[PDB]
Amino acid sequence: SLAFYIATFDIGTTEVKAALADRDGGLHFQRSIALETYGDGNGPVEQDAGDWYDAVQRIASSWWQSGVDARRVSAIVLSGQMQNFLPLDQDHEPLHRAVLYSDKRPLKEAEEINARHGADNLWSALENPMTAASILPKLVFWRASFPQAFGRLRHVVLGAKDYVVLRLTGRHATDRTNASTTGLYRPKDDAWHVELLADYGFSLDLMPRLLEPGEQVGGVSALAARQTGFVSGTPVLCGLGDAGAATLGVGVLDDEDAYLHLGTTGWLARLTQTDPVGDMPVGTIFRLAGIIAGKTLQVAPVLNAGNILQWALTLVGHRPGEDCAEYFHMAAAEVQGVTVPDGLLFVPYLHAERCPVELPAPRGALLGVTGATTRAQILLAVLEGAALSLRWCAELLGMEKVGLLKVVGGGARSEAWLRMIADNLNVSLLVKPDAHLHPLRGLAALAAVELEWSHSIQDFLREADLRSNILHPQPCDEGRRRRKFERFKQCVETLGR
Numbered sequence: 001s002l003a004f005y006i007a008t009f010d011i012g013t014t015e016v017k018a019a020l021a022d023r024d025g026g027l028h029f030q031r032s033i034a035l036e037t038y039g040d041g042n043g044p045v046e047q048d049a050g051d052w053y054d055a056v057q058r059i060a061s062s063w064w065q066s067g068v069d070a071r072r073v074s075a076i077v078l079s080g081q082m083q084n085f086l087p088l089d090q091d092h093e094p095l096h097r098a099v100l101y102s103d104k105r106p107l108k109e110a111e112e113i114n115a116r117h118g119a120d121n122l123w124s125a126l127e128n129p130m131t132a133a134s135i136l137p138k139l140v141f142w143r144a145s146f147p148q149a150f151g152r153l154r155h156v157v158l159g160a161k162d163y164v165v166l167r168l169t170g171r172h173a174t175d176r177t178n179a180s181t182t183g184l185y186r187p188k189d190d191a192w193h194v195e196l197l198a199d200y201g202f203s204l205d206l207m208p209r210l211l212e213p214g215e216q217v218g219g220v221s222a223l224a225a226r227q228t229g230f231v232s233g234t235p236v237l238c239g240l241g242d243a244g245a246a247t248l249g250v251g252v253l254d255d256e257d258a259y260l261h262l263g264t265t266g267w268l269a270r271l272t273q274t275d276p277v278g279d280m281p282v283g284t285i286f287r288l289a290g291i292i293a294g295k296t297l298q299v300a301p302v303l304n305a306g307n308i309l310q311w312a313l314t315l316v317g318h319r320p321g322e323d324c325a326e327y328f329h330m331a332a333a334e335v336q337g338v339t340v341p342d343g344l345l346f347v348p349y350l351h352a353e354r355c356p357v358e359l360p361a362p363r364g365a366l367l368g369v370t371g372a373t374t375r376a377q378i379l380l381a382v383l384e385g386a387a388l389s390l391r392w393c394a395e396l397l398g399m400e401k402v403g404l405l406k407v408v409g410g411g412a413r414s415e416a417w418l419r420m421i422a423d424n425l426n427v428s429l430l431v432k433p434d435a436h437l438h439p440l441r442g443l444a445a446l447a448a449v450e451l452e453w454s455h456s457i458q459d460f461l462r463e464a465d466l467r468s469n470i471l472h473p474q475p476c477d478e479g480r481r482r483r484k485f486e487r488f489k490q491c492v493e494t495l496g497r
């Protein structure tokens with residue numbers, strides 16, 4: 001017998017990652033191609049969509065020339081960046097650089113849309129934020145500055161991997177997980193928000209077809225086979241946005257499962273049964289459809305996360321050009337055995353924030369300093385403050401019944417921060433290493449089911465796992481931790497003046 005594979009790709013924000021997955025959950029022939037982002041942090045956040053497909057071509061070529069027979073690739077499936085704005089013409093050629101999720105230039109457009117339609121009406125329909133980063137504000141902003149290119153508009157691509165799927169198959173599709181993020185999809189109707197699009201003069205023909213992640217979009221076309229070396233006719237599945245694929249990949253499959261991404265920025269998520277949406281949150285919350293039938297992933301994006309720990313290295317002597325490794329080591333060593341006084345509190349909003357509070361300007365402060373305060377207490381207070389912000393997100397997400405948080409990202413290298421999170425959220429934590437592979441694992445599992453390699457995603461993932469210790473919360477004076485948390489919320493409000 002010879003090995004057969006699922007080709008998995010993640011068209012990420014900074015690189016395209018890929019692997020050939022076997023039925024036992026192994027990820028072979030791993031590849032990474034870096035992507036360039038344009039805008040220099042000055043407002044635009046943009047990429048050339050052709051670079052995404054160029055990466056896929058380079059990857060596939062590297063597989064065939066490493067001895068892989070493309071006929072043994074039984075399916076291709078992708079995840080990638082969500083909440084993109086990429087306008088294409090009738091030849092599927094870009095009319096502008098793809099605009100990434102973190103670009104929030106269209107503030108006035110979002111304000112106008114919320115005013116015209118009613119912020120509460122939109123939240124009820126979309127179950128997801130309508131902000132400057134949303135796709136309708138970006139499409140209106142683009143039409144206004146580029147009317148000639150707008151006249152050539154035929155397709156609006158909403159997620160990076162959907163552009164690659166279009167190049168491979170000739171068909172425009174997207175998954176409902178990504179669709180949720182855009183502010184254009186109505187989860188309870190399972191349809192694009194027709195009357196919102198029509199009000200702004202946009203035809204539904206611009207939008208991709210909604211497909212389930214395991215559904216086949218089409219086979220690789222003859223042209224795409226010439227361009228990539230994949231066998232024409234190989235099934236290309238729709239796949240799903242990277243948040244969905246990554247959470248699946250670590251086994252976030254059941255009600256009250258939960259996930260925390262601790263990168264430079266991060267996000268906290270709770271999977272739960274789909275329910276009617278409540279009142280508009282103060283604090284941004286996404287409700288992502290489509291990852292698991294009958295369930296919704298509630299997500300709180302956090303713009304102050306690992307970057308807070310990185311900032312704090314200044315206190316141990318880090319300077320702008322220097323390598324950080326030794327300073328992280330020092331900071332970790334300095335907080336061992338230390339306790340934060342109840343009165344010392346660090347409000348960690350060094351950058352604008354979305355959750356748990358909408359803050360367009362920083363609100364960073366160290367409060368309660370006395371002559372007894374030590375630098376070590378301050379460094380630990382910084383981790384505590386970051387954890388208290390996460391506790392507030394957890395409250396907004398309704399995470400009282402969550403038993404275990406799966407944790408990923410470079411922030412999890414801080415053992416002291418993990419202790420602060422477990423104790424303050426009163427939740428057990430399991431760190432899942434090698435985060436760049438998690439979406440590929442999720443994609444492999446969902447494709448394995450469609451190929452009849454496995455009966456379910458759960459079966460596939462558990463077998464792959466047969467190839468670590470949970471961190472549990474310390475008993476606390478619950479009341480005492482709660483009171484500090486309530487003080488934290490009071491201080492955040494008061495600092496707003």
Ligand SMILES: Nc1ncnc2c1ncn2[C@@H]1O[C@H](COP(=O)(O)OP(=O)(O)O)[C@@H](O)[C@H]1O
Pocket residue numbers: 262263264265305306307308309310325328329408409410411412413414
């Ligand atoms: N040795 C370390 N100890 C603790 N945290 C670290 C260490 N090295 C890096 N980090 C944290 O990891 C974060 C980056 O995580 P990562 O998953 O790479 O996110 P991103 O891709 O968003 O930069 C940084 O904000 C930094 O604070």
Ligand SMILES: O=C(CO)[C@@H](O)[C@H](O)CO
Pocket residue numbers: 082083101181243266267286299300301302
């Ligand atoms: O586009 C989205 C919606 O969640 C992202 O901003 C999230 O932070 C990760 O899921």
